[PDB]
Amino acid sequence: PRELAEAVAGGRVLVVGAGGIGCELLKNLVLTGFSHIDLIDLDTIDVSNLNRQFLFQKKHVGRSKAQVAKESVLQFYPKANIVAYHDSIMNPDYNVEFFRQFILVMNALDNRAARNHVNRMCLAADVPLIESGTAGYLGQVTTIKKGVTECYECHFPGCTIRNTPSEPIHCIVWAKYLFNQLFGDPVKLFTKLFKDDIRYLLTMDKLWRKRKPPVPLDWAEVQSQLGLKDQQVLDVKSYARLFSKSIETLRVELIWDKDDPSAMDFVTSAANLRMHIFSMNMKSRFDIKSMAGNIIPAIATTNAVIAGLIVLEGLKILSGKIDQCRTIFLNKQPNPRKKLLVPCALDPPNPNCYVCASKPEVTVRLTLQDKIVKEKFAMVAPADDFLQDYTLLINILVEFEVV
Amino acid sequence: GGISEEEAAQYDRQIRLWGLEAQKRLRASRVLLVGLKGLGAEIAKNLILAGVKGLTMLDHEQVTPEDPGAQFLIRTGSVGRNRAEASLERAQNLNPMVDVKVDTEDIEKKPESFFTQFDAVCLTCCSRDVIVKVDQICHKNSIKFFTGDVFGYHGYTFANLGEHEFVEEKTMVKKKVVFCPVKEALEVDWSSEKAKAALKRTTSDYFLLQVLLKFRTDKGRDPSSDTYEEDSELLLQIRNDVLDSLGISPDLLPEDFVRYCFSEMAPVCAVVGGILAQEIVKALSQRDPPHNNFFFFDGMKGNGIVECLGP
Amino acid sequence: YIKLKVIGQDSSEIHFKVSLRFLFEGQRIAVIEVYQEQTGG
Numbered sequence A: 001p002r003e004l005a006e007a008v009a010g011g012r013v014l015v016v017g018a019g020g021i022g023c024e025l026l027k028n029l030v031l032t033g034f035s036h037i038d039l040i041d042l043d044t045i046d047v048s049n050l051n052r053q054f055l056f057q058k059k060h061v062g063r064s065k066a067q068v069a070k071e072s073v074l075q076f077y078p079k080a081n082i083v084a085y086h087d088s089i090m091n092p093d094y095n096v097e098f099f100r101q102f103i104l105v106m107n108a109l110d111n112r113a114a115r116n117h118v119n120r121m122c123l124a125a126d127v128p129l130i131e132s133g134t135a136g137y138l139g140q141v142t143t144i145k146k147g148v149t150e151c152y153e154c155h156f157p158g159c160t161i162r163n164t165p166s167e168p169i170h171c172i173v174w175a176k177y178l179f180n181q182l183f184g185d186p187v188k189l190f191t192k193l194f195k196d197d198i199r200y201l202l203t204m205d206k207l208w209r210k211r212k213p214p215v216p217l218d219w220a221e222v223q224s225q226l227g228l229k230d231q232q233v234l235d236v237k238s239y240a241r242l243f244s245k246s247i248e249t250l251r252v253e254l255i256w257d258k259d260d261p262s263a264m265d266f267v268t269s270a271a272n273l274r275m276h277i278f279s280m281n282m283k284s285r286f287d288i289k290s291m292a293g294n295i296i297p298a299i300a301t302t303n304a305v306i307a308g309l310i311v312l313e314g315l316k317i318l319s320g321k322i323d324q325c326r327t328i329f330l331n332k333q334p335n336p337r338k339k340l341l342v343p344c345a346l347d348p349p350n351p352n353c354y355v356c357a358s359k360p361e362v363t364v365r366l367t368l369q370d371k372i373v374k375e376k377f378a379m380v381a382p383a384d385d386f387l388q389d390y391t392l393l394i395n396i397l398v399e400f401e402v403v
Numbered sequence B: 001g002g003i004s005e006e007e008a009a010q011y012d013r014q015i016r017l018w019g020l021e022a023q024k025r026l027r028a029s030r031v032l033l034v035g036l037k038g039l040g041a042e043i044a045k046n047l048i049l050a051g052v053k054g055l056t057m058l059d060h061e062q063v064t065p066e067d068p069g070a071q072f073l074i075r076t077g078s079v080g081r082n083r084a085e086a087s088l089e090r091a092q093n094l095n096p097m098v099d100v101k102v103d104t105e106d107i108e109k110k111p112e113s114f115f116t117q118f119d120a121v122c123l124t125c126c127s128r129d130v131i132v133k134v135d136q137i138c139h140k141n142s143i144k145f146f147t148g149d150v151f152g153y154h155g156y157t158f159a160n161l162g163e164h165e166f167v168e169e170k171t172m173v174k175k176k177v178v179f180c181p182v183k184e185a186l187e188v189d190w191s192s193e194k195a196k197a198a199l200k201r202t203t204s205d206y207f208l209l210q211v212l213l214k215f216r217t218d219k220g221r222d223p224s225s226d227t228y229e230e231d232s233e234l235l236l237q238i239r240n241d242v243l244d245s246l247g248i249s250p251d252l253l254p255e256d257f258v259r260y261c262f263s264e265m266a267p268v269c270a271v272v273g274g275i276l277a278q279e280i281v282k283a284l285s286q287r288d289p290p291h292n293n294f295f296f297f298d299g300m301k302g303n304g305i306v307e308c309l310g311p
Numbered sequence C: 001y002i003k004l005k006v007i008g009q010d011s012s013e014i015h016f017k018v019s020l021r022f023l024f025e026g027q028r029i030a031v032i033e034v035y036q037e038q039t040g041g
C-alpha cells in the first residue's frame, strides 16, 4: 500500500549483524523495497559461515562480512543504498544520535551482551527494535517499543574444576583456564601438571575416600605405549604429543579462539590428558571444539524463516499496526493446535524492570566496575552510562549476588 | 570419511545439527525444482547451501517486465532471458560442490522417464492438473514429491512421501509415516460428520488454496497487482462457486481476502522457501518426522499451521 | 486434582499433578507448551 511503500522508500534502517540472520534479512529488506540500509558487523568471513550466509563465497574468506554483503547485494540490485560498517555496534560512536536516524533497528546478533546494549540504545533513541534469535531448528522474533512493550531485559565451582572433576566439561573448562594461565618447555609443564599436581592432589586424603582417585602420568612412560578425521579419538601418546606440539607452536597476551588450530589443539590435548587421569574416556577434537567453543549448530532454513518474519513484523510497525505485531516462535514440530509457528500478543513493560523502568534501582550484597556494573548489568562505558542514556541505582547490602 | 576435508569444514555447523550420515545422504541426492520465481529462488538457495548432489532448475518461462526489479539470483536487466538460465550463475556460485543444472523445457512435455533421475521433485507455480500428474508419476517410481506456492501474505507447502521411514532422536528410533496422493489431499469430501468436525479446526488457508488453484486453471496465470481490480472481482466469484461447490459457506473465506493474496512478497518466499527446503532435506536424509501433509502460512497473523488432509 | 502435561520444544512429553516461558492455548501462564528464547543468529 502507498503509505507503507513510501515509508519503506523514505526511511533509513539499521541491521546489527551480517551473519546467518543478517544476510537473509539484508536480502529480504532490499527485495521488499527498503531503499536505505545501514549494516554493521565486526567480523570477517570464515569457511564455516558458508553453509548459511549466502552473500559470501569461498573467495571472500577473510574479508569483512558487512562489506561483502553489500557488494553481493549490489550485484543483483545496483541501486540499493547500503552503508556497511566493519565495526562493533558497541563502539561509542554509535550513540543515541546515530540510532535516532533510523525508523527501525533489527538485531541479527549471536549473544545476549550485544543485544542488551542495542536494547538500551533503542529505548534511549525511541526507535522500535525487532529482536530475533535462532539455534539449530528453533528460533523466534519479537518487537520492542519503548512505552509500549516489554524491553529485552524485562524478564562450575573452582573445587569441581581444580580438585574433583567428574564430567568431560570440567576437564575442558580446566584446559581453558590452563591456556589463559600460560598464555592469557613441554616436558616440564607436562609432568608438573599431569604428574606432580595430581600427586599434590592425592595429598588431600579426605577427597578420595568416596570417589575414584586420579592416576598420575609420567611423560617417558606415556611415550612408551567411522566419521571425519576430527571425530576420531586418539590414544594417550597422541594427545601427550599434541600437547607438546601445540605448546611449541604457541610460544613462537593471547586470547583463546576455537579457530586457532594450535590453541584448539592445546585445549583438546590438555583436557584429554586430564580426562584420562580421572578415569574418563577421552573426547574427539570435534566434540571438544563444540564444548570449548560453545558452538551453536546452525543451518540456512531456520535463519531464512526468521529473517522473513522479521521483515513482516517491520512492515506492521511501519504501517502503524504495532498492535498487530507478535512474538513468534518457530517450532520443529507443531503444537497441539497444529501450530508450527506460534504467534503471541506483545507484553507491556514490566514495572519492575532494572533497565527500562522510570527510575531503576537494584540491590547487591575494579571487581565492581568489571564483574558487576559491566558484566552483570551490561554497561559498556560506565551508576551512569551516558552512551546508553541509562542510570541505575545500586543499593549495597560466590563473590557477590543480586537479590 | 565419505566426504572431503573441504566439505567437512564448510558443512561443519550443520553436521553438528543433523550428523554426518544425514549429510552423506544429501550428498547422494538429486532434486528437481520447477519454477524459478520468488519461492523457487529461496528453495534453490537453501538446497544448494545444504549440499545436495545436484539441483536441476526447470522453468520454461522468460523474465518479464512485471517481474520484481530485485531478484537475488538474477541480474537486473534480464528481461527476456529464460528464468532458469538467468538464475544459474548466482545459484551455482552459492556452492560449487553442487551439480546445478538448468532445463528450459515445459514440465508438462516431460516424459515419465525424465523424473527417474531424481530423489525428490518440488513444483512451484504449477497448475493443479500438472501437480496431480507429476504426483502420479512420482508415486509409481517412489519419488519424494513436493509442491508449494506464495500469494501475497500467504503461502503453502505440500508433501507426498508415500510410505516414509525415518529416524528421530527420542538413541535413534526408526519410525514410519504414511502420506496420500495429492489428488485426495486437494479433493476432500466435507459431507461426513467426521469431515464436518474436522472443518471447524481446518485453517481457511486451505480454501484460499482451492480458490487460487482454480484462478490458475482458469486464467493461465496467478492474480497480479497490475490487474488488481479485474483479478479481485474474479477471485470473489471463484470464492462463491468453489465454496458453494463444497457445500461450505463462502463466508469461511472473508470477502477482503483479495487484499492479502496478490504478488510474490519476498519475506513470504523466505518463510515458505525455508520450511519447504527443510522438508526436502528431512525427506532426503530420512531424519526427523516430515509434516503430514500441508503447511499453510499467513504472514498477516504470523500463523504457520500443519494440516493432514486427504485420508 | 488435575491431569496436566508440559510439552517442550523438542516434543519432550512429561506428566504432572498438582529459561522457560509457559503457554496454554496461546496465553502466557499467569497440555502446557514451553518455549525457550534462542540467542544465536
Ligand SMILES: *NS(=O)(=O)OC[C@H]1C[C@@H](Nc2ncncc2C(=O)c2ccn(Cc3ccccc3)n2)[C@H](O)[C@@H]1O
Pocket: A016, A017, A018, A019, A020, A021, A022, A040, A041, A042, A043, A065, A087, A088, A089, A090, A108, A109, A110, A111, A113, A114, C040, C041
Ligand atoms: N548468528 S551468526 O553467527 O550467523 O551471525 C551473527 C553475526 C553478529 C556479528 N556480531 C556483532 N556484530 C556487530 N556488532 C557487534 C557484534 C557482536 O556480536 C559483539 C560485539 C561485542 N560483543 C560482546 C561480546 C564479546 C565477546 C564475547 C561475547 C560477546 N558482541 C557476528 O560477527 C556475526 O557475523
Ligand SMILES: [Zn+2]
Pocket: A150, A151, A152, A153, A154, A155, A349, A350, A353, A354, A355, A356, A357
Ligand atoms: Zn524492561
